[PDB]
Structures are given as structure tokens and as C-alpha cells.
Write a protein that binds this ligand. Structure first.
Ligand code: HEC
Ligand code: HEC
Ligand SMILES: O=C1O[C@H]([C@@H](O)CO)C(O)=C1O
Ligand SMILES: O=C1O[C@H]([C@@H](O)CO)C(O)=C1O
Lengths: 126, 126
């Protein structure tokens, strides 16, 4: 869907900004500093689930740029495994949110965060 | 969810970038220059539906900036009506996509585009 590689870069950077806001805005909730409204969180995690599938299609062939390391492309299978592990952790966060249990949410939230950082450590430029 | 107004501006600008890509990438389809796969479009419009609800929460009180005209805030009811008309047109586009009919899709698509432009004409800086 991108006329030029710059358009894919702009897309993924916007997707990731959204995704970071929808994830990160839950930090006060999982820390107990903001109240836990199970329906609020369920709806937010549904938005996060949609967003979290979006970046990966915007690292298509020829879309080198931004803060993406070139190894995303030369080690495609290993990058796919980090994105699929992350996505699987988003499924687990959805399950916790759908269950309405703050203990499970905070554990699932931590797992997702770990998965974000693991990918960045390997595939995001410093 | 925004620590500073700049964060709301960044959020809405990212949401709108996404939303423009998910809308605009259908232009070749509705013009007949790309093939019409009803399931592909249905899935894309589902993503667009999620995205199209996101910008409006990021024009909260005190979030003046970007290319947003100040009248978004001083004429709040009229801005809400443009966003709700747009959202209603997104419902109609979902219906057309869910029906699998290219004639209905192209009409609904045109209505959505008109609604984007109408809002920009009143509420987006030049
Ligand atoms: C690989 C499978 C990743 C996972 C999982 C997550 N992120 Fe990521 N992120 C990745 C890359 C390769 C890049 C660089 C993209 C580019 O072309 O520049 C990023 C970048 C970000 C950013 C900065 C975005 C910007 O506006 O420029 C943020 C804020 C970010 N990533 C956040 C984020 C979060 C919150 C994640 C888990 C919920 C997450 N990322 C996962 C690769 C990967
Ligand atoms: C008001 C109800 C709007 C509707 C409906 C749509 N848009 Fe919009 N748009 C609006 C404003 C007030 C602004 C400025 C936001 C800011 O703070 O800068 C915008 C901006 C855009 C942009 C530029 C985004 C950027 O990255 O800076 C684009 C590409 C855009 N809008 C696209 C777009 C499309 C495709 C729409 C219908 C599907 C649409 N907008 C509707 C206000 C409103
Ligand atoms: O909100 C975020 O969480 C992850 C990471 O900090 C988790 O360790 C990330 O990159 C964000 O922007
Ligand atoms: O794809 C887009 O469509 C609308 C408008 O051009 C429709 O007239 C807009 O502002 C976009 O970025």
C-alpha cells in the first residue's frame, strides 16, 4: 500500500506510536496507581490487539529505513519469530483482560513488555 | 493518556496517518484498477473502523496544537457532529464491505471521503 519506502517507514512509525500509547497508558492501572475498571481495560486491549498486528506488514521488501536494523530482512525467520512471540503475548493479555483479573493482567502486561524490549534489543537501531 | 499536549498531537497525527493509509489504499480497488477481493476489503474496513474512532479522544481540553483549528474546542458541538457524521459514513462503508458489493463499496467510499474533506475544510489549518 506504499508508493515509496518512506511511506512504509511513516506507516510503521505511526502504528508503533499508537501501539505504545495503548500499551503504556495501562501502566498506572497495572501498578495500582489508577483504578481498575475491567470493562475499560477489556476495550483498550481490544484496540491494542488490532494495532499490534499492523506494524509487521510495513517491513516489506525494499522498505529499509527509519530505526529498523537491516537484519530484519536478512534474518527474516528470526524476526518473524520475535513478532509472533509478541503477538502470542498479546493474545495472553487479551485473555487476562477478558477474564477481568488484575493479577493476571499485570503478569500478562509484563510479558508483553518483555517481548517489545527483546525485539528492540535485536532489531532496532540505537 | 497524554503526559503533555504534544503527546496528544503526536497521537492524533499518527492515528490519522494510519486511518489515511487504510482508507486510501482502497482507491485502486474502488476505481477498478486493482482486483476486488471481498474478504480482503472486509478485513481492511474492519481495521479502518477501529482506527476511525481513535483520533477524537486526542482533541481533549488543553490539547491545542498541530494543524487543529482552535474552533475545534470553541465550537465543540459542531465538531462532534462532523466526527459523528464521518463515523456514521464509516458504518455504511462497513455495511457495503460486509455485503461484498463493489457498487455499494464505491458509493460508500465516496461518502466517507466527502466527510473527511468537509471536516478538514472547517477544522484543519491550511
Ligand atoms: C519486533 C518484532 C518488535 C516488537 C515486538 C516491538 N517492536 Fe517497537 N520497534 C521495532 C522496530 C524494528 C522499530 C523501528 C521502526 C522504524 O522503522 O523506525 C521499532 C520502534 C518502536 C518505537 C519508535 C517509533 C517511532 O515513532 O519512530 C516505539 C515507541 C516502539 N517501537 C514501541 C513498541 C512497543 C510499546 C512494543 C510492545 C507493545 C513494541 N514496540 C514491540 C520492533 C519491534
Ligand atoms: C474532523 C471530524 C475530521 C474528520 C472526519 C477527518 N479529519 Fe483528518 N484531520 C482533522 C484535523 C483537525 C486534523 C489536524 C490534526 C492535527 O492536530 O494536526 C487532521 C489531519 C489529517 C491528516 C494529516 C495528519 C498528520 O500526520 O499530521 C490526514 C492525512 C488526515 N487528516 C486524513 C483524514 C482522512 C483520510 C479522513 C477520512 C477517512 C479524515 N482525515 C477525516 C480532522 C478530521
Ligand atoms: O511503552 C513501551 O513499553 C516498551 C518497553 O519500554 C517495555 O520494556 C516500549 O518500547 C514502549 O514504548
Ligand atoms: O486519503 C485521504 O482522503 C481524504 C480526502 O482526500 C478525501 O477527499 C484525505 O484527507 C486523505 O488523506
Amino acid at each position: 500500500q506504499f508508493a515509496k519506502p518512506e511511506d512504509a517507514v511513516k506507516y510503521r512509525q505511526s502504528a508503533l506510536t499508537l501501539m505504545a500509547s495503548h500499551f503504556g497508558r495501562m501502566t498506572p492501572v497495572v501498578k495500582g496507581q489508577a483504578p481498575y475498571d475491567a470493562a475499560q481495560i477489556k476495550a483498550n486491549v481490544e484496540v491494542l490487539k488490532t494495532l499490534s498486528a499492523l506494524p509487521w506488514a510495513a517491513f516489506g521488501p525494499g522498505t529499509e529505513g527509519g530505526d529498523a536494523r537491516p537484519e530484519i530482512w536478512s534474518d527474516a525467520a528470526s524476526f518473524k519469530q520475535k513478532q509472533q512471540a509478541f503477538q502470542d503475548n498479546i493474545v495472553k493479555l487479551s485473555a487476562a483482560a477478558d477474564a477481568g483479573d488484575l493479577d493476571k493482567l499485570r503478569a500478562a502486561f509484563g510479558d508483553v513488555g518483555a517481548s517489545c524490549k527483546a525485539c528492540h534489543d535485536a532489531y532496532r537501531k540505537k
